[model samples]
Target: GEELFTGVVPILVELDGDVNGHKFSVRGEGEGDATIGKLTLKFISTTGKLPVPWPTLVTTLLQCFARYPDHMKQHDFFKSAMPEGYVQERTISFKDDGKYKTRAVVKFEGDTLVNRIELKGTDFKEDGNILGHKLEYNFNSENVYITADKQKNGIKANFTVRHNVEDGSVQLADHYQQNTPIGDGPVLLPDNHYLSDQTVLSKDPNEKRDHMVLLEFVTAAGIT
Candidate 1:
């Protein structure tokens, strides 16, 4: 699912059925699991932009986080990929899809969860930076600066982050920025905005299936 396999390779996938869904099978004994309903599968490589080592990059990232399970406890690739234990404090915004305006990530942890709607009428600082609750564009930070602007366009806010990576940091731009203040990083726009999720525990304060994590998954990787 990386450059090596997708280029002139012409990958072929098979799906047998109408929109109503159908029974599926593969090579050898791949036909025994008659559990038919909705068999969804995905291919993800958050560091896909860099296209590091498809195999090790995948295994290493997962193995590294397993050592520090708390950070891995909450969902969201952005939060999961931060500098592991030093991620002292963390936070989130009202959300435009699965992405938040900008997250409040501090020295080693992002403990405060701020929302644009919360900051929609003003700005407030929690972990350290000012959460632009009133301004159309919100602000926050980590080892570098991060910001988000919703009124600009899109179902979600455009984003900007002073980018930083270890070429191994595994830190996808906090929520993967759209065309905004992000520098030294990739500029992204939504190809498709969605309200999907994996495993998470918080919400818009009053609902379970509350906010959605709007995003543009590059084939299978999570991105803006």
Candidate 2:
């Protein structure tokens, strides 16, 4: 019945999921406009019956400034078991007034193979050939606003990333050298929604595996 104003806000981020039985989990929190925290990524491989013990692949803290061009500021990197593959971990944070939205991450781990889709006018063309590389592919686009929000009974969030199948590398390049979302665009995830078992394949269709990604949001009281 009355107008209200608030500068401080509460935020929480929890990421937990498994990829082909290789598990990973990380969580962080922030207050006000920005805060510094360690975003640890713990992973364990289940290829063998004796699972790996808490392989903390990433043990670094990156900051996410809402005022910047991209709310997420840094990309924590790691090594791929493949001979010529690469990996990166992204951490995001953003808060605004009462509708506090902060903390989330998307990972792109690649091996030795790469794929490309050329945008020729309104039509799309796949060269029908796969490439190779161990380079970085930018997932940020000038046209999209990557952030989170709260609604009546649920919280909606968005993430943008491109990943390689298994040990393949990532390289999204065009003739104009412009960074674009090949076909993997903005992905939406609600509170505690476990988007799991995304089956993937490399050049060899016979080689296949599953991936899982989840995002959980919380307020000052508890998880939303």
Candidate 3:
């Protein structure tokens, strides 16, 4: 009853601090009708940041949240490392895989995403062993990660989950938050948070936004 998402509101994302190189922003640029559909994002604002050949880490941004459109696509080192593409249908996992097949294309005109999805990779197999590089691979869950072979700097290199990284928790949001950089995950905005057509009121029109937002959603759903 906590509300996965209340109603539809234009959400915003920003860095908690100028921590590292990973950076991204989706604050309604006046054009892209950025809305929540599972993951909420479009493109970055900085231009000098994106260079030729594209960065090695940003490759995993697209293939995320493909199964669940309403899944938040926020990440901590995105084009910026607080966090951070495309896909196919080869009938790759079995029926019990609980996986869905989807593919999206975003035409970007420079740093701006002309028609993008996640700021978004390929399957890697090393030593003739794909399992060796895979980070996680579970059936009724979300985990099929495979690290790249960075023989030079290190034995393995995951452009996203690289360097020194570690942690754990949750299932409700964890499935969506995992893999992406910390703090870089979708922050769903329930429609009840704002005045809307379905918003039911009772006590006061002069009530604060927070107050009215709460009274609108829960308890009004099913009890009948």
Candidate 4:
């Protein structure tokens, strides 16, 4: 059967919804042509919500630790809980195909998950063991939609478990003796700093540290 290659008229539609507390949106286009007829071909795509594993969260926290050296040795809670030979390393590839190394550690107690994290490369010395470094991250799982431009960046990201936080936790100058109120530091504090605020460290002045805003714009326009 011979088919006519006619031009197609496409109709685009966008939809938004919430899943597991995370917001998501889908965009699609339908195509129609003459002769063999009005064939509605829909390219449906969405930026969906992705759950972040506890291990991944730990890794992100470690990366934060490398940024601030002042907080490095203040928190004794982590060192006391960590197990031997628990360290792990991974390599991540960037847009230019450039690779970078990251280190991590996982600690567990009696089948109960205690903590795990990947440290920033900067925190690692040539000899290994954590260097003078400190970092803090606030993380949350939410639904999100990524737009076309972000998709084109080779991000290949259907969804991401977002980690939002400041550069460093408020330091405790005298961990042993300071009677001042310690605003629940990230690692051991009952109220993690990341959960307290939505600010993310950034160089851009126009950008908001709020994760909600990031999710909104990325879903609508795909801009990071």
Candidate 5:
């Protein structure tokens, strides 16, 4: 895997969760040096969903990436999202209920067999909090790739899962900053650049499963 580097750029994302009926916007920047890349994922409330804590919302969005390792392979969401020649195993856990914990596991491959991602949540009683939550996810053969046409640079991938909630659904809504006025062309460097286009790749209306979105960026020249 080749290191994706260009320059420091800002990226923004707005997400709508049909399952929870909540919405939020994320804005951040990506910094990469010779050895490693760093991406900071932040969130803000755009709608009047105040009752829902901001941290919870942020956690939910982060969980999306943690639960679906393929998401990283599909788009430039995290440092691990794109990797070089490496065989690795990773796990992400979420403490959504203060006491309960949720986790996801991922096995990475070079390309074709990108990785196998699994998610699980459990209930426990630690200190004084009573945590009780459990869920599992398994994603396989999910393809992820970036378009060669700089204009089409973004995520393209898919996956499936099994969870505990009867109507548990994950919806991936594309998020990007507004495009620049003077169109020089699509900038391929710096991950924070404004996004030009976004679309919902998979919206499973029936199973209420998680959906994935493709985010495309717009640069000084045009759509990337």
Candidate 6:
């Protein structure tokens, strides 16, 4: 019986996108067993312009995991590809645990020092006003997916994120209490990867530039 959970699978998540001329990338890695919640991430900006804060990025990043069925039903390109189903498919909804709300406030003086940092929600509670090089919120959510299979199966939906900011780094970590879902959604690649045929949208309505997102997931084992 104990041998059933002996093998630990490693999962890697990579998100790349260019929206409104801002190129950004996020990398995350975690395991799929025992200590299943730990996830390490690093967010990078090529053009030095990442508009959203870490909290909000997490929410938008989760949408990358739609499968074939989900893709056909959600995206515009596939909507007209086929006739509507006779019976409308019901939307999936997880129970409201009440701890999903998030609030983060970060202040800096002229981009040289982080004056303050406040974060709360979903096991994330931190408040500080020190001259530290970094501020991090480390916690796990109830249901989040990092792999295609996991999202398809609708199980093992928990994940953790560890984010930090270097002094004067200006990593945009501010947000008011919003109705954000800390967990739940597909962060892995969708079943359909061909963007040539799919219709991409702009992140902002004013700017009609195309916005593109690339999702990737890889699995491995043998880490001692």
The TM-score that candidate 1 achieves is 0.17
Q: Model 2, range 73-96, lDDT digits (tens) per residue?
A: 211110111112122122221111
Task: Indicate the TM-score of model 6.
Answer: 0.25
lDDT (10s digit) by residue, model 5, range 1-224: 22333333233333432212223233222222212222333333344333222222222231112211222233333333333311121222223332112121211233221222121223322221112122212211222222222343322222221123214643221211111111232322223221121112222345232222222221111124
Question: Model 1: residues >4 Å from true position, as ranges?
Answer: 1-181, 184-186, 200-224
Best by lDDT: 6
Error of 3 at 70 (Å): 14
Backbone clashes in candidate 2 total 5
lDDT tens digits, residues 33-105, model 1? 0111111122232211211211111111111111112221222222222222111112222222111222222
lDDT of 6: 0.26
- Give the poorly placed runs of model 5, Cα more than 4 Å off: 6-9, 19-37, 40-42, 59-224
lDDT against the true structure, each candidate:
0.20, 0.21, 0.21, 0.25, 0.25, 0.26
What would the per-residue lDDT of candidate 4 be over residues 31-89, giving only the tens digit for each residue? 43322233332222245431211112221221111111123223222222233213333
Model 6, position 47, has a per-residue lDDT of 34
lDDT of 3: 0.21
List runs of model 6 lying over 4 Å from the truth: 1-6, 34-49, 60-224
